[PDB]
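step 4 of 6: structure.
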Amino acid sequence: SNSIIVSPRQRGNPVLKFVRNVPWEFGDVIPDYVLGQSTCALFLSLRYHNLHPDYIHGRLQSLGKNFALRVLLVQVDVKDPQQALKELAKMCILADCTLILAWSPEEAGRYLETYKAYEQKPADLLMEKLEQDFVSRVTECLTTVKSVNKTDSQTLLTTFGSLEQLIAASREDLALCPGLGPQKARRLFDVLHEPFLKV
Amino acid sequence: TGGGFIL
Amino acid sequence: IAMAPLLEYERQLVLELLDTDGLVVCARGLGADRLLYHFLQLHCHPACLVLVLNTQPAEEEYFINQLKIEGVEHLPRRVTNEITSNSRYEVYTQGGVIFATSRILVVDFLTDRIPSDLITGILVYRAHRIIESCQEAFILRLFRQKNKRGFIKAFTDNAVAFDTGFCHVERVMRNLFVRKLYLWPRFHVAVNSFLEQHKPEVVEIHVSMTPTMLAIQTAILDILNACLKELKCHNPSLEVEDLSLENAIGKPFDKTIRHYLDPLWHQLGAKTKSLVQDLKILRTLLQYLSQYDCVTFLNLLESLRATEKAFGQNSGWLFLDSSTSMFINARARVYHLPKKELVLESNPKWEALTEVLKEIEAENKESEALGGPGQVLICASDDRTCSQLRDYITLGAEAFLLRLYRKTFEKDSKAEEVWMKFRKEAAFGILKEPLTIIHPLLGCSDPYALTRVLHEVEPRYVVLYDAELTFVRQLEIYRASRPGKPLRVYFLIYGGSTEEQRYLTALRKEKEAFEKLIREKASMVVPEETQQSIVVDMREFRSELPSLIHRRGIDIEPVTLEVGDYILTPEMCVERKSISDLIGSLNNGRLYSQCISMSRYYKRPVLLIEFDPSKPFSLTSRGALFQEISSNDISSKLTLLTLHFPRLRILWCPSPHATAELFEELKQSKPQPDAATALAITESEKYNPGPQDFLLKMPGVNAKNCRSLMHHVKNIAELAALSQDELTSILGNAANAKQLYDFIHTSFAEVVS
C-alpha cells in the first residue's frame, strides 16, 4: 500500500489538499495520518490549540504505543507561539512523540509526503560524503589548518604544481603566494613540516 | 475528533 | 620605560577614575594601556587581589617586562589552562594582579574555586567587547552577586564601536555595573591644551599617482560598488549604514559583514557567499595595488584568472568591461607588446622616500655642529612593504625591478639592456652612522614591537611611508613625553588614493562617534538608576543561554562534553542547534554522528532548535515546494533523521529566554545530573596536534598505520622525500603505500587533462 491513510475526521482540512507527490485515501485509523507501518501522524494548529486546550492531550493519550514513530506536526499560525510551544514540547516529551513545526499548509503537506516517501530510504543521505577525488582529498588535507579554506586550497593547487612542490617551498616563497597573506602561509608552513612528537 | 483544524 | 610617569591630563583622568568608578573611552592610541598599566602598578601589592579580563599574552608579557624593569616586587602572574586546577587556587591566595582568561574565570566562579570575598576589584580591558562577547558579562554578573564591594574599572578605545546602530552605550554601562561614563577624545580641552604645547613638526608630502594606477583603482572601485549593490539587493536586511563604498574600503568592514551574516550563514544562498568572497578579493586587490610593485600586482591578477579557469572562484566579475581594463592597464604597467619591451614602471612613492632621505641626510650633515646626527625611523604597513623598501634602497629602482621581473618572467638579455638605456636618460636596518630602521606598522605578533623600537632608537625624524591613527597618536604622546627633544614626522600620501580616503574616514568616524557619545552622556544623566543543576558544555558559554539559566536560580556545572551540550537529567541530552547550524549539520553529516552518540549513551536524546520568530525560515525551498520532493531540502533531511532516530525528541524555541524556562520546566521531579559521569560518557602528549590532522587526512594511512608512520619519520617534508620501496616497507601494504606516493607525487595540471 503506497498511499497515506487519512482519518475520516480530517475531511475539512486544508493541508491534505497540498499533498501532490504521493496518493492518499481515507480509512478508519486512530491517528489522523498513517504514513506506513510503525509511523503515524497527528495534525494540530496552535489556533485550535488555544481554543481547545484539552483536545490534543486526549488524542495523544488515546493514540497508544502501537506505532514506533509517532509525529505530532503543528501549524504555527499564531503571532505569539512561545507559550503554546513550551507546553506542547513538554507533552511530546511525556507522551513519547516527535514534534515537527510547519509554518504553512504547504510545509505540512511536504512533511507528510516526505514521511510517506522515505518509508524504505536508507541513511546514506545524512552521512558524510568524503569524496575520493584527488582534488577533494588534497583540499580536505589543506583544510585542517586553522584558517585555510576551500578557495585558499584552490589557489594553492593552482600556484604550486604538486604537493611535493608545496612541501619544497620555503617560508618566504609560501608567503609570496598571491592571496595567501603572511599569517596563513606562516601557519601552513608550521603545519607543513614540524616534528610529529613532543606536545 | 476535532482534527486540529478550524473550518 | 615607555608608560610610567603619566601626563597631567592623564593624572586628572586617573584621579577621576580613583573616584567613583566608571567606563573610560579614550581616543585611538591615546594611552588607554597607559592607564591600565598605572592601575596594575597601583594594585601590584601582595595584600590585594585584582583580575584583568581581556588581555593578549603578548601584551601581558610586555606589561610584566615593563614592571620588572621598573623594579617592582610581586610581578603579575598569568593563569592559563595549562595550570592545574589545584595549583590555580594557590595562585589566587598569593594575591596581586592576575591575568586570567574568560573560561578559567567562569569555571572558578561557578565552582567557587576562587576567593571571591578577597577580590579587590576587576579591571576590564577592551570594554567594547561586552556588546558581542557574553563571557565577560557573565563573569561580572557572577562577581557582583558574591562580592558587592570590589571595584570595576573599564578601559577602552575605539569609540567607533559604540557608534554602531546595533549597540547602545547604556547596555554596556549597565553590564559593567559602573554607573559613570568618562569621555576623553582627542579634542578634549585638557588633552588639546597640553598636547599643542609639545606638538611635533608634521610635514606632509603629496605624491601624484601614476595615471595607469588611477585607471586600475577606478576599475576596482567600480567592481566593488557593483558587488556591494548586488549584495544589498539580495539582502534587504543589510542596508544599515556599514554597507557603503566608504566603509567597504576600511579594514573593519570584514568584521561588520561577519557579525551581520555569520549567525545565518547557511540560509543565505550560493550567490551571497560568492559576493562576500568577491568583496574580499577586491579589497586584497586594492591593498596590492596601493602597497606593492607592478610585477607583483600583475602576478596576482594573472593568478586570479588561472584559479577561475580551473574552478571559477571569481567568474561573476572577472569578465565585465571594467575588469578587462584592469588587466590591460596592469600589463601596460609591466610590459608593452609592439618580443617583449618591458616598461617596468616604478611606484612614485619610492622617489618621494628617496628625496626625503636625501634631505634628511643633508640636514644631518649640515647640523653636525649642534649635537649628534638624528636617527631616522621609517614605518611601512607590513613586513612585505619593508622588504620592498630595503630592496629598493640598497639596489636602486633599476636592479630591484629587474630582479622582480626576472624572478617570474622569461629571461631576455636583449630586451632588458634597451630598457635601462631609456630609463637612465622585524627591525630592519639601514646605514651605520645614523640608525635608519624600517619597521612594519601592522602584522607583528607582538603589538608592542614598534613601541620598543620607537623608545630604543630615539628617532629624530620619522618617515611615515604609511599612516596609522594609533601610531600617529602614539607619536604625539611620545613627543610630549620628551619636552626638550624635538621630533619631525614626514607623511607620504598618494594624491586621491584609497589610503588617504581611509585615513580621513577613520578620523571623521572617530569624531562623529565621540560627538554622539558626548550627546548621549547628557541624556544618560537622569536615567542613571531542592536545588536543580544542569551540566553545561564549555563551548556553550559564548552565548546568552548559560547566563539566563543561572538567572532562573539553578546552578551550573561547567565541563567539556563530547556528547551533547546540556545534561538536564541523568538520562537527557540536549543538542542546541540554530536554523543555520541545523542546516549545516544536516548537510555535512555532523548531526548524524551526534544523534548516534546520544542514542547510544542516553535514554532520551533531545534536539533543541532555536528559530527566529520575527523572520522565520521556511525550512523548505520556495518554488520546489510546488514540485516533487528533493533530497536537498532541509525538511527532507530532518524527516529522514527522525525516521532513523524514532527515540529522538525535538524542542522548538523562539529565543534563548524561552529555552531557559523550557529547561527549568523539563526537570520538575526527575533526578539530578553530575560531573565526572557525563565526562566518562565519551599519544595525547607525545604527538603534535598540528601535523596530526594533516597526516591522518592523507590517503593511504589509518589509525593502524599512523602510529608506525609518524614514529618512523621526523617530518612531513621528509615523508615526501621517501621512495616508493621505503613506503611499501614501512607501511607493509602495497596498495596504501602506492596511494600515498601517488597522492604526494602527482601534479594538478595532469589531473585536469
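step 5 of 6: annotate
 - Residues 123-198 of chain A form a domain with the DNA polymerase; domain 1 fold (CATH 1.10.150.20).
 - Strands of chain A lie at 4-6, 24-26, 33-34, 39-45, 69-75, 98-102.
step 6 of 6: archive
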